Chains A and B, each alone.
Chain A
Amino acid sequence: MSTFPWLTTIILFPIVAALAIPFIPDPTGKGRPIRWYALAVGLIDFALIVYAFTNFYDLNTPGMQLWESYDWIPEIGLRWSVGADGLSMPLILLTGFITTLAILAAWPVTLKPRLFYFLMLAMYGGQIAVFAVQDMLVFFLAWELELIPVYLLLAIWGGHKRQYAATKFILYTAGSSLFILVAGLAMAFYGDTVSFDMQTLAAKDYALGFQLLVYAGFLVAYGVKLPIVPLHTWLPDAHGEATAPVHMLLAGILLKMGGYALIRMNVDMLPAAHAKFAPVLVILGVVNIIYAALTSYAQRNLKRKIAYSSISHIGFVLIGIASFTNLGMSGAVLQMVSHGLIGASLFFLVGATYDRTHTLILEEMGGVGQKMKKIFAMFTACSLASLALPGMSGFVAELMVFIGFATSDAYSLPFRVIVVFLAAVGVILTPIYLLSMLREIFYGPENKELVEHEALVDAEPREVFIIACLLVPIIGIGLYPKLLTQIYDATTGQVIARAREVLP
């Protein structure tokens, strides 16, 4: 061990192992020792994640665990302070799981495999660095750590409008991490201490007016990363023009930071401004759901339709954040894990059927399900998981968000009536698009103009293995939610009890 630096090893071991990528011998050029080395590093890091979790993480402790705090730069208060909370540990486990599955799903790449698996391991160490660190300047560092890796994963591999997508992504995310640094420096220079630690910054007492400004800066910075529909248009370009492993860890994990940090430094740090801004967050989550379901329906592209569905499923996260109950916050964390699994399965399957059919337009690709039957089966199962089907993890989080919002007596009664009415029309709208695209992509008679040009080969055993590894925790959490809720029910119980002290 419990004195071993665990989260420092978890963060830095994929980066240090990615520095050994150009020294791996590979005479054939296609990059098979590089993909096996990256899969080995991903599996070893996930094994160390689950070993630290099952030994040195206590499920009944609301405070920070696995705590390390090394002294980086004492002049400015820069410390390497890492820690595993209840808001962090499901996302750390999900990051390890989805990044290992994305490295395994990244196996058809042969364009620049050394650079590809270097960037994927440098995202593996750097995604966990967002959920793990407890210093605000290191939070800004780990937040901006995905600027150049996602740029090069977007711009070299995947898509025809990939350069504009990568450009808009990197400029938009840099202009939002601007506000990350501004709000962190503002709330760390408040009062007569320059402690940059996130617990000490949550322990301060900021006046209102300062809290509203820091919440506005954090809200811009997280409403870009979490897709909030005025600030969401980086996502359909940056996700409709990405390869399937990059899209897997791009909307399975990178949308969850910014949504993890909506709890960490907007609810747990500025509750007096959260109590002022929470009706706006509830309405913006409702508009996320309905708006992105409608734009999912109108998309004739496949990847942009699934990208807009990924925008739609975080509105329940927003409603669960801005509802002041334990079940609402628990359903918000449950949605940011369940949508990670469900979405990553959908992006992998969309990339698989694009690697087979060589087209993204729903007006092509007619009776494709006659030839790839396993891709049809897995795609129907994961699309059903997206529809909030019970027995799968997408329904439980949405039901908990609905119940935890409607029972929240902090809001008025017509507000709760209008919101849970409007949040429930996405229950209609998600089967509409996600079954019209199934009807248009896999069903019907076989498109003979397509099968003459492309080899419609069925799924590999590796792809069936990846979708089964994604669907096992989906069904296992939708059948028994206290597998996951028991990881974070203490800390969220610490958060809501800290955030209900402001409401009248």
Chain B
Amino acid sequence: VISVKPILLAMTPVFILLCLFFGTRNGFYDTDQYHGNGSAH
């Protein structure tokens, strides 16, 4: 049985850095193609 703790400790800074990176990688909602305000009405 392998442990979940080194896997989680090695995958969470990758998760944090890729969240902070992929925040800056949006190309539909910040353009004029999206006719909305985030609410679903």
A→B interface (CB under 8 Å): 36, 39, 43, 46-47, 50, 53-54, 59, 100, 104, 106-111, 116, 156-160, 162, 241-244, 351, 354-356, 358, 455, 457, 459-462, 465, 469, 480, 482-484, 486-487
Q: How far is the CB of A108 from chain B (nearest CB, A)?
A: 4
Q: Which residues of B contact A480 (CB under 8 A)?
A: 2
Q: Which residues of A contact B39 (CB under 8 A)?
A: 109, 111, 156-158, 243
Task: Give the CA-CA distance A457 to B36 in the complex, in Å.
Answer: 14
Q: Select A157's contact among B4, B19, B35, B40, beta carbons within 8 Å.
A: B40
Q: Fill in one digit per residue for B24-41: 1 if any A CB lies within 8 Å of its CB, else 0.
A: 011111000111111111
Task: Give the CA-CA distance A465 to B20 in the complex, in Å.
Answer: 11
Q: Select B38's contact among A54, A109, A242, beta carbons within 8 Å.
A: A109
Q: Select A355's contact among B13, B26, B34, beta carbons within 8 Å.
A: B34
Task: Give the CA-CA distance A59 to B11 in the complex, in Å.
Answer: 19
Q: How far is the CB of A36 from chain B (nearest CB, A)?
A: 7
Q: How far is the CB of B31 from chain A (nearest CB, A)?
A: 8
B interface majority secondary structure: loop
Q: How far is the CB of A181 from chain B (nearest CB, A)?
A: 34
Task: Give the CA-CA distance A351 to B29 in the complex, in Å.
Answer: 13
Q: Which residues of B contact A160 (CB under 8 A)?
A: 41
Closest to B12 in A: A50
B15 touches A469 (CB 8 A): yes
**With contacts A457-B28, A487-B4 known, is A354 near B40, CB below 8 A?**
yes
Q: How far is the CB of A356 from chain B (nearest CB, A)?
A: 8
Q: How far is the CB of A239 from chain B (nearest CB, A)?
A: 12
Q: How far is the CB of B28 from chain A (nearest CB, A)?
A: 5
B→A interface (CB under 8 Å): 1-9, 12-13, 15-16, 18-20, 22-23, 25-29, 33-41
A460 touches B25 (CB 8 A): yes
Q: How far is the CB of B5 from chain A (nearest CB, A)?
A: 4
Q: Which residues of A contact B15 (CB under 8 A)?
A: 46, 469
A483 touches B4 (CB 8 A): yes
B16 touches A483 (CB 8 A): no
B26 touches A461 (CB 8 A): yes
Task: Give the CA-CA distance A111 to B29 in the complex, in Å.
Answer: 13
Q: Which residues of B contact A156 (CB under 8 A)?
A: 39
12 A-B pairs within 8 Å (CB atoms) are namely A59-B5, A104-B23, A106-B38, A108-B34, A156-B39, A241-B40, A243-B38, A243-B39, A457-B28, A465-B18, A465-B22, A487-B4
A interface majority secondary structure: helix
Known pairs A43-B20, A47-B12. 9 more at Cβ < 8 A?
A43-B16, A46-B12, A53-B5, A59-B4, A107-B23, A157-B38, A242-B40, A355-B34, A486-B1
Task: Give the CA-CA distance A155 to B3 in the complex, in Å.
Answer: 43
Q: How far is the CB of B24 from chain A (nearest CB, A)?
A: 9
Closest to A352 in B: B28
**With contacts A50-B9, A484-B4, A487-B4 known, is A461 near B36, CB below 8 A?**
no
B23 touches A462 (CB 8 A): yes
Q: How far is the CB of B15 from chain A (nearest CB, A)?
A: 7
Q: Which residues of B contact A486 (CB under 8 A)?
A: 1, 3-4
A53 touches B8 (CB 8 A): yes
A455 touches B33 (CB 8 A): yes
Q: Which residues of B contact A47 (CB under 8 A)?
A: 12-13, 16
Task: Give the CA-CA distance A106 to B23 in the complex, in Å.
Answer: 11
Task: Give the CA-CA distance A109 to B8 in the complex, in Å.
Answer: 30
Task: Give the CA-CA distance A480 to B40 in the complex, in Å.
Answer: 37
Q: How far is the CB of A206 from chain B (nearest CB, A)?
A: 36
Q: Select A460's contact among B5, B6, B29, beta carbons within 8 Å.
A: B29
A159 touches B26 (CB 8 A): no
Q: Select A108's contact among B3, B5, B36, beta carbons within 8 Å.
A: B36
